[PDB]
C-alpha cells in the first residue's frame, strides 16, 4: 500500500493457435534477497481466464481473492454457459478497481495481465463447472482470444502479446521483431524460452525456474515447472 516490499519479476502472455500461453518465473524477491524461490505468480479466475502479476505480492493476493470470489458469485447465479463472464469483463472490472484506487491515492503496486478466451462456441467446459478436482486442441481465431494490460494509474489496452516489468524492453523487442501469427505451440514455447533466457541473463530479479500455463479449448493447464535449458 505504501510501497513494494516483496515483488515479482515479469510475465509474458502471447496468443497462438489453440489459445494463449503465459509464462512467469517462480520467485519473489525481498529487495535484493530472493527469499522465496517457489511462488505461483499466475492465478486462475475461471476456465478461459487467467491473471498475470508483476509487482507487490500482497496486492496481487488481494486482487486474486476479489476476482475468484467474483467468479464464485457469477457461477452461483449462472444458468447457461453463455452467462460466464468473459476476459473482457474481468479486464474492465480490474481497470475500474485500479481507477478508483488511483482516485483515492492508494494504488496497487502491480501491473496486471488478464488473458483468456471471450468466445463460447468452441468447447462445452463451462456447461458443467468443477472448481475442486479436474481429444485434440481446436484452432482458435485470434479474434476470439483476449489479452489485456492494466497499469498502476489504470491505463489499460488490448493486444496480441503483452509483457510487464523488465520484459517490456527485452521480450517486447524480441516479440515485435519475430512474433508471427498462428504459430504452433512448439514455436510459441521456443520464443517464450528465448525471451525468458534473455531476461535471466540481464535481470537480477529474474530466475530460471519457470512456470508456464496454457488457456485452450481444454481449459486452463498448469504445465509442470521446468528449469530453463540455458
Amino acid at each position: 500500500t505504501l510501497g513494494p516490499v516483496v515483488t515479482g519479476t515479469s510475465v509474458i502472455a502471447i496468443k497462438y493457435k489453440h489459445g494463449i500461453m503465459i509464462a512467469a518465473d517462480r520467485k519473489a524477491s525481498y529487495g535484493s534477497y530472493a527469499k522465496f524461490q517457489n511462488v505461483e505468480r499466475i492465478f486462475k479466475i475461471n476456465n478461459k481466464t487467467v491473471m498475470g502479476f508483476s509487482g507487490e505480492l500482497a496486492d496481487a493476493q488481494y486482487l486474486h481473492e476479489l476476482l475468484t470470489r467474483k467468479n464464485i458469485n457469477n457461477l452461483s447465479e449462472k444458468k447457461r454457459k453463455e452467462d460466464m463472464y468473459t476476459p473482457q469483463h474481468y479486464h474492465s472490472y480490474v481497470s475500474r478497481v485500479f481507477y478508483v484506487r488511483k482516485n483515492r491515492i492508494d494504488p496497487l503496486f502491480n501491473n496486471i495481465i488478464i488473458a483468456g478466451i471471450n468466445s463460447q462456441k468452441y468447447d462445452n467446459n463451462d456447461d458443467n463447472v468443477l472448481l475442486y478436482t479436474n481429444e485434440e486442441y481446436k484452432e482458435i481465431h485470434k479474434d476470439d482470444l483476449y489479452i489485456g494490460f492494466v497499469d498502476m494509474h489504470g491505463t489499460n489496452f488490448c493486444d496480441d502479446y503483452i509483457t510487464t516489468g523488465y520484459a517490456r524492453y527485452f521480450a517486447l523487442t524480441l516479440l515485435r521483431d519475430h512474433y508471427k501469427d498462428n504459430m504452433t505451440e512448439e514455436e510459441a514455447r521456443i520464443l517464450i524460452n528465448e525471451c525468458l533466457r534473455i531476461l535471466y541473463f540481464r535481470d537480477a530479479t529474474s530466475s530460471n525456474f519457470i512456470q508456464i500455463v496454457k488457456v485452450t479449448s481444454k481449459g486452463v493447464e498448469y504445465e509442470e515447472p521446468y528449469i530453463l535449458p540455458c
Partner: protein, 204 residues
C-alpha cells in the same frame, strides 16, 4: 531478533532467542513467532487470539462423536482427532488480512506453526504488508536469521528425525546469536507434533 522454523517428519519445530518470549501460544496446536515492532506485534497477537477463540467455539459440532540445561514441559492435546481445533490456514489468512488492512502502519513479520488433521504439520510466513507464503521446508525471520540462511540451506534434509531437527535448529539459533549483535539470551524452542506439544529452553 532471530526466528526459525523447521518442518521435520511428523511434527514441526520453532526456535527463537530472548532479547529486546517471542513464541506465543495461539492454541494448543497453534503457535506463532513475532519479529519487528513489539507493540504492533503484541496487539495483533491479542487480536488473532481473540479471533481464534471465536472460531474454535463456533466450529464445535452438536452431538456425541467418536464412540546446558534443557528444561522441558509437555502438554497433551485436549481435543483428540482435532474435532474443533481451528485450521492453521484459517488463522494464518485472517492474520494476513488484518495486517493487509493496516499495512500503512503495521510492520511486523510473523511465522505460524501448527498441526492440523486436514494438512498435517504446516509452516506459514506472513511478511511485511499482507503477504502470506506457505513454506514446506523451513522459514526464517529477523535480523539474525540472515547470517544462518545459507547454513540452513546446506544442512536441511527432506525427512529429518526429531533429534536431527533439534540439533540443526539449536545450532542455527546459536550461530545467529553469535554473529548478530541484536540477538541474545537463552534459546526457546517448541516442538508441535500430532498428539502433543513440548516446549523447552536451552541456556547455552
Amino acid at each position: 531478533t532471530t526466528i526459525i522454523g523447521i518442518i521435520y517428519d511428523n511434527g514441526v519445530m520453532l526456535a527463537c532467542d530472548s532479547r529486546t518470549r517471542k513464541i506465543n501460544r495461539i492454541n494448543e496446536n497453534l503457535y506463532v513467532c513475532r519479529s519487528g515492532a513489539s507493540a504492533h506485534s503484541q496487539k495483533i497477537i491479542e487480536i488473532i487470539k481473540h479471533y481464534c477463540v471465536s472460531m474454535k467455539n463456533e466450529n464445535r459440532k452438536k452431538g456425541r462423536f467418536h464412540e546446558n540445561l534443557v528444561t522441558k514441559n509437555k502438554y497433551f492435546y485436549e481435543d483428540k482427532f482435532n474435532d474443533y481445533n481451528p485450521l492453521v490456514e484459517n488463522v494464518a489468512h485472517i492474520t494476513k488480512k488484518i495486517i493487509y488492512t493496516n499495512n500503512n502502519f503495521l510492520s511486523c513479520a510473523l511465522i505460524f506453526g501448527g498441526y492440523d488433521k486436514i494438512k498435517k504439520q504446516q509452516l506459514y510466513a506472513v511478511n511485511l504488508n499482507g503477504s502470506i507464503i506457505e513454506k514446506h521446508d523451513f522459514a526464517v525471520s529477523g535480523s539474525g536469521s540472515i547470517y544462518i540462511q545459507s547454513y540452513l540451506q546446506d544442512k536441511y534434509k527432506k525427512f529429518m528425525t526429531k533429534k536431527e531437527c533439534f540439533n540443526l535448529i539449536l545450532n542455527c539459533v546459536k550461530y545467529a546469536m553469535h554473529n548478530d549483535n541484536s540477538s541474545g539470551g537463552l534459546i526457546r524452542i517448541v516442538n508441535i507434533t500430532k498428539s502433543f506439544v513440548e516446549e523447552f529452553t536451552v541456556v547455552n
